[PDB]
Amino acid sequence: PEPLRKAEKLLQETGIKESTKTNTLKKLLRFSVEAGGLTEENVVGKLQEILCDMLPSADKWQEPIHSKYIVLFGSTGAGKTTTLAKLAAISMLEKHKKIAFITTDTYRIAAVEQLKTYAELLQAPLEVCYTKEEFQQAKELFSEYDHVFVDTAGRNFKDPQYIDELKETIPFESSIQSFLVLSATAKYEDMKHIVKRFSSVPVNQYIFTKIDETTSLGSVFNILAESKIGVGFMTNGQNVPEDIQTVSPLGFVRMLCR
């Protein structure tokens, strides 16, 4: 092979598991030895293209915050709370709307004080529910609001005891835009195990945090690559609410190439 050695390093520099890494080159060389002619230059673009088609239809990416309720659940320490912040500061100080807050984060000591004083800065309300009875109660209390940002308890979502618990408190229906927050820092094998666990709970988009601490993004590719949905936002720093962006398939696939 020739300009392929060049592309074999690319797929290697990225995360991308083996199954894929190898399968991509298969696809490249096939539709290449028959299609046109590869250059030392156009290898990547052709490379990026093929990859991009392994993800979900680009329409499944960049779904804006539309529905009323905006919930966020995920791994412990990835960016759940600090993100709702970044989002809220947008749905108010930018798209000018009636903003509210609700939290399910009980389990941890003084865990609430955080968002508690996060709202105190956005002059928005806040409710803390320990039972769905209270959560729905909370939904009425904000009825007149455009967007109600929900927060959740950080939990090791492997043990099933916790996906039940989540579906217990929150209802999940018509007016809810769920988001699964994951850190681009997590190992693929890990993420894949929990993603399968949220199979029993609806989810609109992906939120991958800490892309700036990452070293590669292939671990993120593999997750999306084998999923129905794409990614909503992607935090990229601590600074609130600046450090946070949004991306599209090919655009992502473009950060991916190490």
Ligand X SMILES: Nc1nc2c(ncn2[C@@H]2O[C@H](COP(=O)(O)OP(=O)(O)NP(=O)(O)O)[C@@H](O)[C@H]2O)c(=O)[nH]1
- Dihedral in degrees, nearest 10, Cα atoms 104, 127, 137, 89: -90
Residues 51-90, one symbol each (x = binds a copy of itself by CB under 8 A, - = not), give ------------------------xxxxx-----------
Q: Which stretch binds ligand X (CB under 6 A): 51-59, 132-140, 172-180, 206-214?
A: 206-214
Of 252, 195, 250, 186, the C-alpha closest to 228 is 195
Shorter beta-carbon distance to ligand X: residue 81 or 222? 81
Please report whether residue 147 would count as binding a copy of itself according to CB under 8 A: no
One symbol per residue from 116 to 155: x for binding ligand X (CB under 6 A), - otherwise; what is it?
Answer: --------------------------------------x-
The structure tokens listed for 134 are 């209270």
CB 244 within 8 A of CB 234: yes
Min. distance of Cβ 112 from ligand X in angstroms?
A: 10
The entry of ligand X, a copy of itself, Mg ion, none near residue 60 (CB within 5 to 8 angstroms by kind) is none
Nearer to Mg ion, 100 or 247 (CB): 100
Strand-strand pairing, 231-235 and 244-246: antiparallel
Q: Which residue has the tokens 């959740």?
A: 152
Half-sphere exposure of 122 (CA within 13 A, CB side): 29
What is the phi/psi pair of residue 251, to 5°?
Answer: -70, -40
- Does 243 sit near ligand X (CB under 6 A)? yes
Q: How far apart are CA 59 and CA 151, in angstroms?
A: 26
Q: Using the rule CB under 5 A, is 68 a contact of Mg ion?
A: no
**Residue 243's binding partner, choosing from ligand X, a copy of itself, Mg ion, none, with beta-carbon cut-off 5 to 8 A by kind?**
ligand X
Is residue 80 at the binding interface for Mg ion, with CB under 5 A as the rule?
Answer: yes
Which stretch of DSSP H or E encloses residue 135?
helix 132-140
The annotation status of 21 as a binding-site residue, yes or no, is: no
Q: What is the spatial distance between Cα 39 and Cα 243, in angstroms, rounded to a whole number?
A: 37
Q: Is 155 in the site for a copy of itself (CB under 8 A)?
A: yes
Per the DSSP assignment, residues forming a β-bridge with 246 are 233
Task: Return the CA Rg of the chain.
Answer: 20
> Using CB under 8 A, which of 1, 212, 242, 246 touches a copy of itself?
212
Applying CB under 8 A, among 3, 171, 237, 241 the residue interacting with a copy of itself is 237
- Residue 179's closest CA among 28, 56, 75? 75
123 binds a copy of itself (CB under 8 A): no
Q: Pick from a copy of itself, ligand X, Mg ion, none: which does 158 bind, CB < 5 to 8 A by kind?
A: a copy of itself
Cα 151 from Cα 242, distance rounded (Å): 20
| Residues 6-35, interacting with a copy of itself (CB under 8 A) | 15
Out of 81, 91, 104, 205, the only residue in the binding site for Mg ion (CB under 5 A) is 81
Q: Which residues bind Mg ion (CB under 5 A)?
A: 80-81
